[PDB]
Amino acid sequence: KYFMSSVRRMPLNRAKALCSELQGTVATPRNAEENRAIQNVAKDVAFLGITDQRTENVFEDLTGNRVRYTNWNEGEPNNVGSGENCVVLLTNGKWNDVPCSDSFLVVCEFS
């Protein structure tokens, strides 16, 4: 896997379209090593290819596969407010669930 970070911020729909444009997908860490690699390429908070849009509190990658490895920041995922169904990687490498309509950097994954 190769990871590339965007320079501009955007909602998940646009982030997905960006990674897809170059035939990749939004980065999904499967272990601590991939998590670190993604953190290092990201200079700020960035979207990961994980959501619980289909079923609340059931986090899966953009292809419907349930994720095994997680690295939630203490207190997350909390689905605050009207709902948080997307996931971002904070600058310390931990994850936070956020609204899919908010804007963050994106890290794309390629094989």
Task: Tell me which of a second copy, Cl ion, ligand MAN, none is bound by residue 40, counting a contact when its beta carbon lies within the kind-specific cut-off of 5 to 8 angstroms.
Answer: none
Task: Tell me which of ligand MAN, Cl ion, Ca ion, none is bound by residue 79, counting a contact when its beta carbon lies within the kind-specific cut-off of 5 to 8 angstroms.
Answer: Ca ion
Residue nearest Cl ion, Cβ-based:
85
Q: Using CB under 8 A, which of the segments 17-25, 46-54, 72-80, 94-102 binds a second copy?
A: 17-25
Residues 35-54 that bind a second copy (CB under 8 A): none
Give least dist CB 98 to ligand MAN, A. 5
Alpha-carbon distances of 96 from 7, 24, 29, 30, 50, rounded to whole Å: 20, 23, 14, 16, 11
Residue 21 region by backbone torsions, left for phi larger than 0, else alpha for psi between -120 and 50, else beta: alpha
Dihedrals phi, psi of 99, to nearest 5 degrees: -70, 135
Instruction: Report the C-alpha gap between 4 and 75 in whole angstroms.
Output: 28
User: What does the binding site for Cl ion look like in residue numbers (CB under 5 A)?
Assistant: 83, 85, 99-100
